[PDB]
């Protein structure tokens, strides 16, 4: 039941989800290869709980948009996201995903937050694999309720919990 309505139970389930964060990569460009580097035998996102990698979208809570999101790919990524189980989070990797990046033109979406509810942003071109790990710990402690913005506000555990999907 969303992991709510008991002081101990919700912290326990958030602990569980935070460490069991299941990445589903949505590789678009070179951000995707720099994310593939976050899994090799120098710096692996295979310790915190992200060892397994199920290509199916029915099986992962974290959606990592890694690369430039072309406007022709926007509905596809939209429906891949909608076709995810509900306790789901969105990471936006790299400049092309976060903003329009250096490609400010008709072809690329200027903020992936337009199509999918983004949870974490991670700048860089490409963002270093260790910056991506910083982002996943950021999201970890976010779903732990340990995340605050520059304005002082605590951030909700799950974005895409706040939208009128339709």
Nearer to other proteins, 8 or 164 (CB): 164
Residue 141, H or E segment: helix 129-143
CA distance 125 to 102: 10
DSSP 11-63: HHHHHHHHHT--EEEEE-SHHHHHHHGGGSSSS-S-SSS-----SSGGG-SEE
Binding of other proteins at residue 73 (CB under 8 A)? yes
| Residue in the block written with tokens 């915190």 | 48
Binding of ligand SF4 at residue 101 (CB under 6 A)? yes
Contact pick of 109, 143, 157, 158 for other proteins (by CB under 8 A): 109
Binding of other proteins at residue 98 (CB under 8 A)? yes
Residue 92, H or E segment: strand 89-93
Nearer to other proteins, 17 or 98 (CB): 98
Binding of other proteins at residue 64 (CB under 8 A)? no
Applying CB under 8 A, the span of 2-10, 11-19, 142-150 interacting with other proteins comes to 142-150
Q: Could you say which of ligand SF4, other proteins, none residue 145 binds, taking C-beta under 5 to 8 angstroms by partner kind?
A: none
């Amino acid at each position: 039941r969303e992991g709510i309505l008991f002081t101990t139970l919700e912290k326990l389930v958030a602990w569980g989800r935070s460490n069991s964060l299941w990445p589903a990569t949505f590789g678009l460009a070179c951000c995707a290869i720099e994310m593939m580097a976050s899994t090799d035998a120098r710096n692996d996102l295979a310790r915190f709980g992200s060892e397994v990698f199920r290509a199916s979208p029915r099986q992962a809570d974290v959606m990592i948009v890694a690369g430039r999101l072309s406007k022709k790919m926007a509905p596809v990524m939209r429906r891949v996201w909608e076709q995810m189980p509900d306790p789901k989070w969105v990471i936006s990797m790299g400049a092309c995903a976060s903003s329009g990046g250096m490609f400010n033109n008709y072809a690329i979406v200027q903020n992936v937050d337009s199509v999918v509810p983004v949870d974490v942003y991670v700048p860089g071109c490409p963002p270093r694999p260790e910056a991506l790990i910083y982002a996943v710990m950021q999201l970890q402690k976010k779903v732990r309720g340990q995340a605050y913005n520059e304005r002082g506000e605590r951030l909700p555990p799950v974005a895409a919990w706040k939208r009128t999907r339709g």
